[PDB]
Amino acid sequence: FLDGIEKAQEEHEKYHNNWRAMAEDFQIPQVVAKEIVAQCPKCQSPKTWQMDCTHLEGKVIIVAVHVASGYIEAEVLPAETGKETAHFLLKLAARWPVKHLHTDNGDNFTSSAVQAVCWWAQIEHTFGVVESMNHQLKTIITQIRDQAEKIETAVQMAVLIHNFKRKGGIGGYSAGERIIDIIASDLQTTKLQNQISKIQNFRVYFREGRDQQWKGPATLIWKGEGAVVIQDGQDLKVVPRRKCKIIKDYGR
Amino acid sequence: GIEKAQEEHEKYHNNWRAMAEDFQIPQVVAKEIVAQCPKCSPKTWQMDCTHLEGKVIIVAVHVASGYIEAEVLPAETGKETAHFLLKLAARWPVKHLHTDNGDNFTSSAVQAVCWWAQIEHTFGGVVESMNHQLKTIITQIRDQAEKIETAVQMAVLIHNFKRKGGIGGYSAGERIIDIIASDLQTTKLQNQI
Amino acid sequence: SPKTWQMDCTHLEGKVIIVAVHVASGYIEAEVLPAETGKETAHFLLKLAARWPVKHLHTDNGDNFTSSAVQAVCWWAQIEHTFGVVESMNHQLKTIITQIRDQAEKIETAVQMAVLIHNFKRKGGIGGYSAGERIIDIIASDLQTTKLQNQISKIQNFRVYFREGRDQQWKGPATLIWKGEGAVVIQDGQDLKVVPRRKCKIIKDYG
Amino acid sequence: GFLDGIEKAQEEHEKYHNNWRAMAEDFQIPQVVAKEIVAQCPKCQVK
Ligand SMILES: [Zn+2]
Ligand SMILES: [Zn+2]
Ligand SMILES: [Zn+2]
């Protein structure tokens, strides 16, 4: 255990590895690896969307794009007012976790209805990827145009072909697999951070070898069945449970 | 399988490598299927040159795996770019080269090396992210070496063998080895059967 | 061993060439140095370890191979250096250089063209493969072995919530063993069992 | 409800620096929030 922790500290001192790789390679828990990364001075977005409006055959197509993956949601609006833009934004925020929105300085994007929807759903709106995605979507729409009768059907069929049929990039994935992988990784990080804060509200008094006096208050990092990892003096060390006393700490 | 590939391409208009992978068809049939439609790679490398501390870093990236190869140049001529391309072709199998509309990539020595090593040259969002990741690793381990050339080569080692990220969880060197080995066995099976 | 390399330095046309060879495949990397100092040798070893997985190095008792620069690069990249194939590859490389000597101006371009010829245009041996095909096959097989042992544990870190016969509550988190097309093998309290696919929910369960 | 008791106990501790059992018995709030009100004060210490 302690051999793995010292090997992980030496390896991070050379190459600055990440915590998932260190936890998988050196066989230590994930909270200890996250602490090793958090003690480094040289080591210290999944929810941002961009919106735009475009025209096709006298109809208004509104396109939202997820930036970190290239994922697309599109619609056909009856007009270009602010009420229909606010309804499209409310539907997008109901289906996906949206926290940061990037638009241009259009009229319908600068409106009281969009402002009220962003207030209720707690979105940060900023005025200034979507143009490249609009061009790629319109090439698909002219490619599969004769398989449909109306324009709304052709728009949704092109959204399906873009999201689940075109593969590329590094590993050769579509956009739907990339957005699900990105959001799942963020969910793992937030759950581990909750566990880290709940564990680190404690404090440890430990009794060193060949001494009968208790040492200073060391912060708890990991508590096992027979081992305890503590931080003391900018040092991590492993003390067994028979020489430890864990007490609550109120040091806010 | 040919009927399934024809119905799939009639609906969604997929490319030939997607049908050949997902339906297990030899590639000549899929190429002719895509070629018959009216409405319509493990050796593709992309190159770039950038600036850092008054030096010129030339960076070539294998696109199917994110495998990096960087050098610090003493000049931005055509001869040194051709020599870097010649060493890259002498180390790995290079068959498709992508670059931008630059001044050094359109020269007599670059065209002579591409003609001699049989590389298809084409001129036009992966190389920018690779340049950003290389600069961030260089600014991470800058104070471990004195000269900038050692810092570039140490960042190349850290990028190729010490960053295991992505959807699968693999480093870029193991990915390029698996990709070329799988393509070799696939072309061997299509030549045998 | 699939990660052993051997190094040497030679002279040709008044220059100094350095040659590193992967032993189990006969794979050649070679460059032209301006000098025989330890700094340029250590720079070549750093570039070689940055491009290919290098773990064990064999050299002769030279003057540049025994230096603090080479010791520093070997310590930082975690290579094991020992002092005592390369001469046979040197002889073959000189013969190829003399074969295509009238196609390049400098000797550096001649060394690089001979390296491309030796690595991808000289098929021989038993099976009939070149050097690049052999090195790619060998390192891929070694990767497959070690990653197999890690990947089985990765697939057993998932959690399954299943349903038995005529009880309408979802039972607790068994461990996944294999997920088929119409059946799932789970281990529940040291009991292996086979459940249909429509009666299972497979989570990773962060919490 | 005891949330108004939480606000009143914060004002009362800002004046008089009560202990946590006194605030828990007087304002009828649970013991965890009372120990937290003591813990966030820089001058006091829960004991
Ligand atoms: Zn660090
Ligand atoms: Zn087609
Ligand atoms: Zn107080």
XYZ file of C-alpha atoms and ligand atoms in Angstrom:
702
model
C 0.000 0.000 0.000
C 2.543 2.561 1.202
C 4.893 1.303 -1.513
C 2.180 2.094 -4.057
C 1.631 5.553 -2.585
C 5.352 6.372 -2.713
C 5.619 5.023 -6.271
C 2.636 7.149 -7.312
C 4.186 10.255 -5.746
C 7.505 9.685 -7.558
C 5.734 9.036 -10.869
C 3.611 12.176 -10.514
C 6.758 14.126 -9.634
C 8.316 13.087 -12.943
C 5.449 13.054 -15.443
C 2.394 14.685 -13.715
C -0.108 11.887 -14.294
C -3.856 12.189 -13.776
C -5.734 10.558 -10.928
C -7.670 7.939 -12.925
C -4.467 6.618 -14.500
C -2.621 6.539 -11.165
C -5.524 4.780 -9.446
C -5.685 2.152 -12.197
C -1.928 1.576 -12.454
C -0.558 1.675 -8.914
C -3.650 0.042 -7.297
C -4.534 2.706 -4.723
C -8.020 4.165 -4.045
C -9.275 7.140 -6.017
C -9.477 9.605 -3.120
C -5.759 9.121 -2.386
C -4.840 9.662 -6.047
C -6.989 12.795 -6.160
C -5.169 14.075 -3.065
C -1.786 13.452 -4.756
C -2.902 15.557 -7.732
C -4.386 18.207 -5.410
C -1.095 18.704 -3.538
C 0.807 19.655 -6.704
C 1.471 23.362 -7.390
C 1.850 22.940 -11.163
C -1.543 21.279 -11.729
C -3.636 24.126 -10.291
C -16.708 22.448 -20.827
C -19.352 19.719 -20.508
C -22.366 22.030 -20.125
C -21.964 24.885 -22.641
C -24.194 25.247 -25.696
C -24.248 27.617 -28.674
C -27.436 28.713 -30.440
C -28.063 30.239 -33.867
C -30.814 30.842 -36.421
C -30.622 30.195 -40.163
C -32.957 30.159 -43.169
C -33.950 27.441 -45.636
C -36.753 27.520 -48.265
C -38.373 30.495 -46.549
C -38.427 28.666 -43.201
C -36.473 29.463 -40.040
C -34.300 26.652 -38.676
C -32.955 27.113 -35.153
C -29.889 25.038 -34.260
C -28.286 24.391 -30.871
C -24.878 22.705 -30.692
C -22.986 21.066 -27.831
C -19.448 22.371 -28.197
C -17.329 19.672 -26.556
C -18.806 16.897 -28.729
C -20.538 18.423 -31.746
C -24.044 17.280 -30.810
C -27.011 18.928 -32.528
C -30.622 19.724 -31.679
C -32.618 21.522 -34.379
C -36.155 22.771 -34.969
C -38.347 24.617 -37.472
C -39.996 27.751 -36.051
C -43.191 29.423 -37.312
C -41.670 32.900 -36.842
C -38.499 34.536 -35.519
C -39.929 36.174 -32.409
C -38.690 35.821 -28.842
C -41.523 33.665 -27.543
C -40.708 30.748 -29.842
C -37.005 31.138 -29.059
C -37.833 31.038 -25.342
C -39.917 27.893 -25.834
C -37.081 26.173 -27.731
C -34.638 27.106 -24.957
C -37.011 25.780 -22.277
C -37.336 22.439 -24.086
C -33.550 22.118 -24.470
C -33.012 22.923 -20.786
C -35.681 20.365 -19.851
C -33.929 17.542 -21.703
C -30.200 18.231 -21.153
C -28.198 19.878 -18.349
C -27.590 23.412 -19.665
C -25.587 25.931 -17.645
C -23.872 28.284 -20.108
C -25.410 29.637 -23.311
C -23.562 31.488 -26.070
C -25.474 33.469 -28.685
C -24.976 36.428 -30.997
C -26.571 39.868 -30.621
C -29.809 39.123 -32.438
C -33.163 40.657 -31.627
C -35.020 37.539 -30.476
C -32.044 36.404 -28.390
C -32.104 39.757 -26.549
C -35.645 39.707 -25.223
C -37.598 39.664 -21.983
C -38.956 36.162 -22.656
C -35.487 34.649 -23.128
C -34.359 36.616 -20.060
C -37.191 35.178 -17.947
C -36.497 31.608 -19.098
C -32.781 31.992 -18.316
C -33.682 33.350 -14.871
C -36.031 30.455 -14.074
C -33.728 27.720 -15.377
C -30.506 29.324 -13.973
C -28.486 29.700 -17.177
C -25.619 32.141 -17.754
C -26.189 33.917 -21.069
C -23.295 35.478 -22.995
C -23.534 37.542 -26.180
C -20.819 37.601 -28.822
C -18.858 26.115 -34.258
C -22.513 26.756 -35.072
C -21.708 28.040 -38.568
C -19.658 24.947 -39.440
C -22.445 22.746 -38.083
C -25.042 24.733 -40.057
C -23.093 24.174 -43.280
C -22.661 20.449 -42.586
C -26.348 20.050 -41.712
C -27.436 21.840 -44.888
C -25.298 19.558 -47.048
C -27.058 16.573 -45.456
C -30.503 18.220 -45.930
C -29.889 18.688 -49.661
C -28.567 15.112 -49.789
C -31.669 13.378 -48.354
C -34.250 15.910 -49.563
C -36.163 13.657 -51.983
C -36.958 11.034 -49.321
C -39.372 13.374 -47.506
C -42.329 15.567 -48.397
C -42.128 18.485 -45.950
C -39.119 20.403 -44.641
C -39.575 19.484 -40.947
C -39.268 15.786 -41.784
C -36.055 16.392 -43.743
C -34.607 18.485 -40.904
C -35.187 15.750 -38.313
C -33.877 13.020 -40.631
C -30.682 15.027 -41.149
C -30.324 15.490 -37.378
C -30.516 11.697 -36.964
C -27.913 11.087 -39.697
C -25.565 13.690 -38.183
C -25.868 12.410 -34.614
C -25.790 8.637 -35.098
C -24.468 7.758 -38.579
C -21.377 9.914 -39.236
C -18.271 8.738 -37.370
C -14.874 10.360 -37.082
C -12.408 12.017 -34.770
C -9.811 10.187 -32.711
C -11.437 6.891 -31.830
C -14.025 6.826 -34.599
C -17.190 7.659 -32.667
C -20.395 9.489 -33.480
C -21.544 12.618 -31.644
C -24.045 10.855 -29.371
C -21.411 8.524 -27.946
C -19.097 11.477 -27.312
C -21.698 13.540 -25.436
C -22.680 10.579 -23.243
C -19.020 9.835 -22.426
C -18.345 13.502 -21.543
C -21.359 13.888 -19.232
C -20.673 10.526 -17.534
C -17.087 11.553 -16.754
C -18.297 14.816 -15.185
C -20.861 12.912 -13.088
C -18.121 10.621 -11.751
C -16.002 13.621 -10.728
C -18.798 15.361 -8.796
C -19.791 12.214 -6.866
C -16.177 11.600 -5.835
C -15.833 15.238 -4.711
C -18.874 14.854 -2.434
C -17.274 11.798 -0.803
C -13.969 13.671 -0.398
C -15.521 16.561 1.544
C -17.574 14.223 3.760
C -14.452 12.218 4.684
C -12.270 15.299 5.210
C -14.531 16.700 7.940
C -12.662 14.457 10.456
C -9.376 14.582 12.397
C -6.937 11.909 13.571
C -4.737 11.534 16.667
C -2.129 8.824 16.142
C 0.499 7.106 18.281
C 3.852 6.520 16.586
C 6.053 3.462 17.011
C 8.087 3.234 20.249
C 6.428 6.335 21.732
C 3.637 6.622 24.302
C 2.589 10.202 23.462
C -0.091 11.012 20.904
C 1.022 13.144 17.967
C -0.580 16.158 16.342
C -3.985 16.414 14.654
C -3.570 14.901 11.191
C -6.284 15.202 8.564
C -8.022 12.010 7.476
C -7.810 11.041 3.803
C -8.896 7.403 3.654
C -10.258 5.074 6.334
C -9.977 1.348 5.669
C -10.777 -1.830 7.550
C -7.263 -2.030 8.984
C -5.380 0.958 7.581
C -5.751 4.739 7.775
C -4.135 7.265 5.417
C -3.423 10.633 7.023
C -1.926 13.919 5.897
C 0.493 15.600 8.302
C 3.321 18.074 7.705
C 2.779 18.076 3.906
C 3.356 14.311 4.039
C 1.069 11.331 3.456
C 1.503 8.259 5.624
C -0.294 5.041 6.533
C -1.044 4.253 10.190
C -2.934 1.114 11.324
C -6.220 1.400 13.185
C -4.897 0.099 16.513
C -2.776 3.261 16.964
C -5.374 5.799 15.794
C -8.252 7.797 17.273
C -10.659 9.548 14.896
C -12.624 12.530 16.228
C -14.941 15.044 14.586
C -13.402 18.403 13.720
C -15.274 21.704 13.798
C -12.858 24.038 12.065
C -15.000 25.959 9.590
C -24.593 -8.782 -46.718
C -24.558 -6.894 -50.007
C -28.339 -6.454 -49.805
C -28.061 -5.128 -46.238
C -25.317 -2.711 -47.301
C -27.400 -1.522 -50.261
C -30.450 -0.864 -48.072
C -28.294 0.891 -45.458
C -26.605 3.158 -48.018
C -29.941 3.873 -49.714
C -31.297 5.152 -46.394
C -28.376 6.883 -44.690
C -25.632 7.245 -47.383
C -22.766 5.808 -45.347
C -19.158 5.673 -46.536
C -17.383 2.535 -47.701
C -15.232 1.902 -44.618
C -18.279 2.088 -42.327
C -20.154 -0.539 -44.355
C -17.045 -2.717 -44.726
C -16.427 -2.636 -40.968
C -20.002 -3.094 -39.763
C -21.159 -5.663 -42.335
C -17.839 -7.530 -42.964
C -17.633 -7.062 -46.743
C -14.388 -6.792 -48.776
C -13.541 -3.197 -49.584
C -13.812 -3.363 -53.390
C -17.539 -4.171 -53.182
C -18.179 -1.295 -50.763
C -16.146 1.103 -52.918
C -18.221 0.203 -55.977
C -21.455 0.537 -53.959
C -20.544 4.102 -52.963
C -19.357 4.823 -56.524
C -22.705 3.716 -58.023
C -24.711 6.324 -56.081
C -25.734 9.606 -57.775
C -26.019 11.689 -54.586
C -22.434 10.936 -53.505
C -7.838 5.626 -42.747
C -4.942 4.160 -40.749
C -2.176 5.947 -42.715
C -3.333 9.588 -42.776
C -0.944 12.115 -41.212
C -1.467 15.856 -40.726
C 1.367 18.374 -40.426
C 1.724 21.862 -38.950
C 4.326 24.411 -37.863
C 4.038 26.735 -34.872
C 6.133 29.179 -32.851
C 7.463 28.887 -29.299
C 10.089 31.176 -27.679
C 11.316 32.353 -31.076
C 11.802 28.779 -32.310
C 9.815 26.816 -34.881
C 8.192 23.537 -33.829
C 7.077 21.275 -36.677
C 4.453 18.784 -35.499
C 3.033 15.769 -37.353
C 0.038 13.913 -35.913
C -1.364 10.508 -36.805
C -5.069 11.307 -36.953
C -6.655 7.913 -36.221
C -4.850 7.690 -32.861
C -3.454 11.100 -31.919
C 0.171 9.995 -32.160
C 2.533 12.962 -32.084
C 5.988 13.634 -33.525
C 7.635 17.017 -33.007
C 10.934 18.660 -33.881
C 12.586 22.018 -33.258
C 13.744 23.489 -36.558
C 16.758 25.752 -37.139
C 14.961 27.303 -40.138
C 11.572 27.449 -41.852
C 12.876 26.498 -45.320
C 11.652 23.747 -47.640
C 14.694 21.498 -47.282
C 14.336 21.001 -43.524
C 10.589 20.388 -43.820
C 11.367 17.806 -46.511
C 13.992 16.182 -44.272
C 11.512 15.900 -41.395
C 8.960 14.396 -43.794
C 11.592 11.949 -45.064
C 12.434 10.778 -41.537
C 8.716 10.431 -40.771
C 8.198 8.286 -43.877
C 11.304 6.242 -43.036
C 9.933 5.441 -39.565
C 6.194 4.836 -40.151
C 4.064 3.908 -43.171
C 2.834 7.235 -44.575
C 0.394 7.178 -47.489
C -1.788 10.308 -47.153
C -0.434 13.707 -46.100
C -2.622 16.680 -45.202
C -1.331 20.228 -44.839
C -2.548 23.798 -45.086
C -1.870 26.430 -47.753
C 1.602 27.343 -46.551
C 4.843 28.474 -48.134
C 7.175 25.696 -46.958
C 4.800 22.837 -47.845
C 4.762 23.841 -51.545
C 8.364 23.477 -52.693
C 10.551 21.459 -55.034
C 12.209 19.409 -52.280
C 8.872 18.592 -50.629
C 7.427 17.530 -53.989
C 10.534 15.432 -54.704
C 10.348 13.631 -51.347
C 6.596 13.057 -51.779
C 7.203 11.667 -55.277
C 10.013 9.377 -54.115
C 8.203 7.989 -51.050
C 4.809 7.838 -52.872
C 2.742 10.107 -50.621
C -0.508 11.767 -51.697
C -0.378 15.461 -50.774
C -3.575 17.411 -50.072
C -4.077 21.015 -48.968
C -6.937 22.403 -46.900
C -9.766 20.515 -35.821
C -7.395 17.908 -34.395
C -3.930 19.402 -34.972
C -4.920 22.591 -33.143
C -5.937 20.626 -30.051
C -2.705 18.626 -30.288
C -0.686 21.857 -30.458
C -2.549 23.207 -27.418
C -1.925 20.001 -25.449
C 1.769 20.023 -26.383
C 2.152 23.635 -25.228
C 0.419 22.899 -21.916
C 2.694 19.922 -21.203
C 5.758 22.033 -22.150
C 4.691 24.754 -19.698
C 4.206 22.015 -17.084
C 7.714 20.512 -17.227
C 9.682 23.554 -18.422
C 11.896 23.816 -15.318
C 13.109 20.200 -15.516
C 15.473 20.835 -18.444
C 17.636 23.719 -19.588
C 17.316 23.789 -23.377
C 13.993 23.909 -25.217
C 14.747 20.873 -27.422
C 14.893 18.547 -24.413
C 11.635 20.075 -23.148
C 9.944 19.358 -26.488
C 11.126 15.737 -26.561
C 10.107 15.133 -22.938
C 6.657 16.542 -23.690
C 6.429 14.163 -26.668
C 7.243 11.195 -24.403
C 4.697 12.337 -21.792
C 2.042 12.794 -24.487
C 2.630 9.466 -26.229
C 3.038 7.163 -23.226
C 1.826 8.880 -20.027
C -1.626 10.297 -20.914
C -4.238 7.522 -20.947
C -7.460 9.379 -21.689
C -10.450 9.247 -23.981
C -13.427 6.904 -24.315
C -11.409 3.678 -24.244
C -8.646 4.634 -21.830
C -5.545 3.963 -23.918
C -2.319 5.830 -24.571
C -1.576 7.009 -28.095
C 1.394 4.717 -28.766
C -0.570 1.584 -27.923
C -3.432 2.882 -30.061
C -1.298 3.390 -33.175
C 0.277 -0.063 -32.728
C -3.144 -1.735 -32.409
C -4.537 0.201 -35.394
C -1.726 -0.732 -37.793
C -1.670 -4.356 -36.586
C -5.435 -4.717 -37.076
C -5.261 -3.164 -40.554
C -2.416 -5.527 -41.469
C -4.392 -8.604 -40.399
C -7.536 -7.330 -42.159
C -5.772 -6.810 -45.500
C -4.066 -10.189 -45.015
C -7.456 -11.887 -44.566
C -8.951 -10.141 -47.603
C -5.923 -11.195 -49.659
C -6.105 -14.789 -48.385
C -9.858 -15.334 -48.768
C 12.579 -9.889 -25.130
C 10.125 -7.585 -26.937
C 11.580 -4.332 -25.534
C 15.358 -4.741 -25.880
C 17.403 -2.323 -27.978
C 21.081 -2.219 -28.927
C 23.091 0.879 -29.826
C 26.340 1.573 -31.685
C 28.216 4.315 -33.548
C 30.194 4.023 -36.785
C 31.863 6.158 -39.454
C 31.099 6.550 -43.163
C 32.415 9.157 -45.661
C 34.067 11.190 -42.909
C 30.827 11.398 -40.910
C 29.667 9.731 -37.690
C 26.485 7.646 -37.913
C 24.640 6.322 -34.856
C 22.514 3.171 -35.217
C 19.964 1.714 -32.782
C 18.430 -1.677 -33.562
C 15.395 -3.477 -32.160
C 16.707 -7.004 -31.778
C 13.692 -9.303 -32.120
C 12.575 -7.687 -35.394
C 15.725 -6.145 -36.870
C 14.204 -2.661 -36.861
C 16.589 0.199 -37.611
C 16.710 3.809 -36.471
C 19.793 5.747 -37.561
C 20.967 9.362 -37.668
C 24.066 11.390 -38.543
C 25.679 13.157 -35.615
C 27.962 16.201 -35.914
C 30.117 14.938 -33.014
C 30.690 11.992 -30.675
C 30.015 13.866 -27.438
C 27.714 12.541 -24.730
C 25.122 15.296 -25.167
C 24.202 14.291 -28.720
C 24.142 10.609 -27.748
C 21.781 11.408 -24.866
C 19.582 13.487 -27.187
C 19.321 10.563 -29.620
C 18.398 8.218 -26.766
C 15.733 10.652 -25.544
C 14.145 10.879 -29.003
C 14.239 7.083 -29.372
C 12.560 6.585 -25.990
C 9.985 9.252 -26.881
C 8.986 7.493 -30.111
C 9.103 3.775 -29.189
C 8.710 1.848 -25.918
C 12.304 1.352 -24.734
C 12.935 -0.610 -21.539
C 16.356 -2.311 -21.748
C 19.445 -0.983 -23.525
C 22.652 -2.780 -24.505
C 25.816 -0.952 -25.556
C 29.561 -1.477 -25.714
C 32.185 0.109 -23.469
C 32.501 3.401 -25.320
C 33.390 6.915 -24.251
C 30.035 8.573 -24.984
C 27.879 5.700 -23.690
C 29.471 6.106 -20.230
C 28.537 9.675 -19.342
C 26.445 11.654 -16.881
C 24.183 12.851 -19.708
C 23.279 9.306 -20.782
C 22.876 8.358 -17.116
C 20.503 11.297 -16.577
C 18.367 10.429 -19.616
C 18.248 6.757 -18.590
C 17.188 7.718 -15.058
C 14.449 10.077 -16.249
C 12.991 7.652 -18.807
C 13.536 4.590 -16.531
C 15.734 2.587 -18.906
C 18.194 -0.052 -17.715
C 21.605 0.390 -19.342
C 24.098 -2.475 -19.623
C 27.550 -2.663 -21.202
C 28.711 -5.847 -22.910
C 23.518 -7.842 -34.437
C 24.302 -4.133 -34.728
C 27.437 -4.853 -36.764
C 25.438 -7.001 -39.193
C 22.837 -4.243 -39.546
C 25.705 -1.767 -40.011
C 27.130 -3.879 -42.847
C 23.696 -4.208 -44.485
C 23.038 -0.467 -44.156
C 26.378 0.410 -45.770
C 25.619 -1.909 -48.699
C 22.220 -0.261 -49.271
C 23.814 3.223 -48.998
C 26.309 2.251 -51.716
C 23.429 0.879 -53.821
C 21.421 4.125 -53.938
C 24.313 6.576 -53.482
C 23.733 8.283 -56.860
C 20.212 9.473 -55.974
C 20.906 11.969 -53.164
C 23.333 14.844 -52.728
C 24.192 14.630 -49.025
C 24.990 11.568 -46.921
C 22.145 12.355 -44.494
C 19.478 11.876 -47.178
C 21.296 8.694 -48.235
C 21.144 7.312 -44.678
C 17.427 8.105 -44.421
C 16.617 6.517 -47.792
C 18.584 3.400 -46.829
C 16.642 3.222 -43.552
C 13.334 3.363 -45.460
C 14.589 0.644 -47.832
C 15.768 -1.644 -45.011
C 12.616 -1.204 -42.942
C 9.868 -1.399 -45.577
C 11.345 -2.750 -48.847
C 13.454 -5.778 -47.812
C 11.097 -8.686 -47.168
C 12.791 -11.896 -46.141
C 12.899 -14.303 -43.272
C 10.652 -17.307 -42.804
C 7.106 -15.963 -43.020
C 7.988 -13.301 -45.580
C 7.626 -10.070 -43.604
C 9.647 -6.857 -43.462
C 11.010 -5.254 -40.289
C 8.106 -2.900 -39.573
C 5.514 -5.674 -39.779
C 7.529 -7.802 -37.356
C 8.020 -5.061 -34.753
C 4.331 -4.092 -34.901
C 3.212 -7.727 -34.473
C 5.572 -8.360 -31.536
C 4.695 -5.275 -29.479
C 0.965 -5.715 -30.167
C 1.070 -9.282 -28.811
C 2.858 -8.162 -25.629
C 0.269 -5.414 -25.075
C -2.584 -7.900 -25.548
C -1.267 -10.181 -22.778
C -0.776 -7.563 -20.044
C -3.945 -5.634 -20.857
C -5.961 -8.882 -20.754
C -5.111 -9.306 -17.084
C -6.210 -5.736 -16.337
C -9.373 -5.800 -18.500
C -11.059 -8.745 -16.757
C -11.057 -6.848 -13.450
C -12.374 -3.765 -15.260
C -15.367 -5.744 -16.539
C -16.053 -7.169 -13.083
C -16.328 -3.699 -11.524
C -19.908 -3.205 -12.828
C -23.048 -3.709 -10.728
C -26.227 -5.544 -11.758
C -29.767 -5.127 -10.390
C -31.799 -8.168 -11.385
C -35.255 -9.679 -10.935
C -36.116 -13.273 -10.034
C -39.288 -15.299 -10.401
C -42.624 -13.682 -9.448
C -41.157 -11.201 -6.965
C -41.557 -7.587 -8.029
C -38.561 -6.041 -6.233
C -35.164 -5.387 -7.782
C -32.511 -7.420 -5.976
C -29.216 -6.002 -4.799
C -25.977 -5.287 -6.613
C -24.509 -8.554 -7.878
C -21.232 -8.526 -9.803
C -21.174 -8.805 -13.584
C -19.188 -11.626 -15.202
C -20.329 -11.679 -18.832
C -23.053 -9.879 -20.773
C -24.414 -11.839 -23.720
C -26.999 -11.034 -26.357
C -29.940 -12.591 -24.527
C -28.510 -13.636 -21.167
C -26.336 -12.162 -18.414
C -24.043 -14.113 -16.078
C -23.900 -12.622 -12.588
C -22.248 -13.624 -9.332
C -24.480 -13.110 -6.301
C -23.155 -14.182 -2.897
C -20.701 -16.758 -4.337
C -23.486 -18.116 -6.564
C -23.229 -17.916 -10.344
C -26.502 -17.617 -12.212
C -27.867 -16.801 -15.657
C -30.584 -14.135 -15.918
C -32.359 -12.988 -19.111
C -31.348 -9.644 -20.580
C -34.783 -8.068 -20.038
C -34.601 -8.598 -16.248
C -31.312 -6.783 -15.521
C -30.036 -3.226 -15.099
C -26.270 -2.727 -15.371
C -24.910 0.395 -13.635
C -21.478 1.559 -12.565
C -23.073 3.258 -9.516
C -20.911 6.180 -8.440
C -21.818 6.237 -4.747
C -40.735 24.757 11.773
C -37.338 25.597 13.207
C -35.741 27.555 10.334
C -36.789 30.864 11.892
C -35.243 29.498 15.074
C -32.018 29.004 13.109
C -32.002 32.674 12.065
C -32.809 33.865 15.601
C -30.112 31.613 17.088
C -27.544 33.105 14.712
C -28.454 36.624 15.876
C -28.391 35.530 19.532
C -24.939 33.955 19.200
C -23.627 37.056 17.414
C -24.581 39.025 20.530
C -23.970 36.785 23.534
C -21.875 33.770 22.311
C -24.056 31.009 23.735
C -23.065 27.354 23.915
C -24.710 24.848 21.590
C -26.876 22.921 24.075
C -28.320 26.229 25.285
C -29.264 27.276 21.745
C -30.660 23.817 20.976
C -32.853 23.837 24.084
C -33.986 27.465 23.829
C -34.708 27.720 20.094
C -35.820 24.074 19.518
C -33.410 23.323 16.692
C -31.489 20.035 16.237
C -28.020 19.600 17.655
C -26.127 19.456 14.348
C -27.150 22.964 13.255
C -26.417 24.348 16.738
C -22.915 22.852 16.704
C -22.477 24.339 13.217
C -23.462 27.817 14.471
C -20.787 27.494 17.166
C -18.268 26.096 14.657
C -18.533 28.956 12.165
C -17.718 31.575 14.816
C -13.978 32.413 14.881
C -13.840 33.247 18.599
C -15.738 30.209 19.892
C -15.036 26.483 20.047
C -17.527 23.666 20.576
C -16.683 21.682 23.705
Zn 1.223 17.719 -10.850
Zn -25.083 7.622 -51.607
Zn -19.158 32.952 19.174
